[PDB]
């Protein structure tokens, strides 16, 4: 426990670096938004307030940030891709109205590739003119042109485009977000009245990966639940209600980062991310809904409880998306058997040796 605390204290030492790089990133993205909204294809584009920094849980890599630009899209209908539950084709129910996105259709289908290509292009053009310092664009691959920026200092910013839908959440989410006994049924009702998002993400398809498919995203809900996280409305707003929920999440994230860094020459950990750890953490909150199960003085147990849960997920190769229960983040489609066995082994070693990877 003392060791765990020491690790947390240490992680605090990165806060200023990260905060300053973020404080620059906001400048770059604000400039970017300003320009992007002038394009007829994106005039309603806005910043979505989501992500590890916004959740007060970005603990390392100040050179690295994730941002989502949301784009309100006029009334859409979704068609599931196979029975993947998380991947969809986007269609407009149409309304013979002026639709600035018609130039990205494939008949009925809103092409993620064309959208991304325009997004990438405009971003490319609007950066060279200096705000702050200097900025480049890395060119990756995948099923489409994604966008990663290089704010000169090697500050890497991933930009994700996300369609916003103000309609009811898809049926695949019906049994998800099981927070009723933790955060309350009225809260679940409220959250599910909020919009949901769609990000352009190629779905796997037989040794390759095809289609202009979109994946459901609930980053805004994850942020709300992380920052308003207790059964008590005043959890963490006073000295008598300090829980260790956020610290346990930070510890799990740090465990994963440190293991990835250690084995950065093998490729076995490449497919794991803080999203897996966050998802497992949310399930553990569902399992342990009472604030008294997250007493600060119990940091040691609470952390072990997360680790154990994650291990079981790894061992069983099942980690349900917290919002889409039948979407398995650890399915063989997404993560290979060897990566999962290897992480299982390393986490077992760490747990069995008082977590050497921390010191
Ligand atoms: Zn709390």
What's the alpha carbon Rg, rounded to whole Å?
A: 21 Å
Question: Which topology of the largest domain does CATH recognise?
Answer: Poly(a)-polymerase, middle domain
Tell me the structural class: alpha+beta
Main β-sheet description: 9 strands, mixed
Based on the coordinates given, report the CATH architecture of the largest domain. Answer: Orthogonal Bundle
Gross morphology is globular
Number of DSSP E strands? 11
Discrete helix count? 9
What ligands can be seen in this structure? zinc ion
- Name of the CATH class of the largest domain: Mainly Alpha
Modified residues (5-glutamyl glutamate): 153
Protein name: Cyclic GMP-AMP synthase
GO cellular component, one term: cytosol
Motif (Nuclear export signal): 8-13
Description:
Its cofactor is Mg(2+); Mn(2+); Zn(2+). It is a single chain. It is globular, with a radius of gyration of 21 Å. The chain folds into two domains: 1-13 and 169-195 and 218-359, Poly(a)-polymerase, middle domain, CATH 1.10.1410.40; 14-168 and 196-217, 2-Layer Sandwich (Beta Polymerase, domain 2), CATH 3.30.460.90. The longest helix is centred in the first third of the chain and has 22 residues, at 15-36. Strands 1, 2, 3, 4, 7, 8, 9, 10 and 11 form a nine-stranded mixed beta sheet that branches. Strands 5-6 form a two-stranded antiparallel ribbon. It has nine helices and eleven strands. A hairpin with a 2-residue loop joins strand 5 (105-106) and strand 6. The relative contact order is 0.12. The protein is an alpha+beta fold and 359 residues long. Zinc ion binds at residues 229-230, 235-236, 243, 245.
């Amino acid at each position: 426990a003392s060791k765990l605390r020491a690790v947390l204290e240490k992680l605090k030492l990165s806060r200023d670096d990260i905060s300053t790089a973020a404080g620059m990133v906001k400048g770059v993205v604000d400039h970017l938004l300003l320009r992007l909204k002038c394009d007829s294809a994106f005039r309603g584009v806005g910043l979505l307030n989501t992500g590890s920094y916004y959740e007060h849980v970005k603990i390392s890599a100040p050179n690295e940030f994730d941002v989502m630009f949301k784009l309100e899209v006029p009334r859409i209908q979704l068609e599931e891709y196979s029975n993947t539950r998380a991947y969809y084709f986007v269609k407009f129910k149409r309304n013979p109205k002026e639709n600035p996105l018609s130039q990205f259709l494939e008949g009925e289908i809103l092409s993620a590739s064309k959208m991304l290509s325009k997004f990438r292009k405009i971003i490319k053009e609007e950066i060279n003119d200096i705000k702050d310092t200097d900025v480049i664009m890395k060119r990756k691959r995948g099923g489409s042109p994604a966008v990663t920026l290089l704010i000169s200092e090697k500050i890497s910013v991933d930009i994700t485009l996300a369609l916003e839908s103000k309609s009811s959440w898809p049926a695949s989410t019906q049994e998800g977000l099981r927070i009723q006994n933790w955060l309350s049924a009225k809260v679940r009702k409220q959250l599910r009245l909020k919009p949901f998002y769609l990000v352009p993400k190629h779905a796997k398809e037989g040794n390759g990966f095809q289609e202009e498919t979109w994946r459901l995203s609930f980053s805004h809900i994850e942020k709300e639940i992380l920052n308003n996280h207790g059964k008590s409305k005043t959890c963490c707003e006073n000295k008598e209600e300090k829980c260790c929920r956020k610290d346990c999440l930070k510890l799990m994230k740090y465990l994963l980062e440190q293991l990835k860094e250690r084995f950065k020459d093998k490729k076995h950990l490449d497919k794991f991310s803080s999203y897996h750890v966050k998802t497992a953490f949310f399930h553990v909150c569902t399992q342990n809904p009472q604030d008294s199960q997250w007493d600060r003085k119990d940091l040691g147990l609470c952390f072990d409880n997360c680790v154990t849960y994650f291990l079981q997920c790894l061992r069983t190769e099942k980690l349900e998306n917290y919002f889409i229960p039948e979407f398995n983040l650890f399915s063989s489609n997404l993560i290979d058997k060897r990566s999962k066995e290897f992480l299982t082994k390393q986490i077992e070693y760490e747990r069995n040796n008082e977590f050497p990877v921390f010191d």
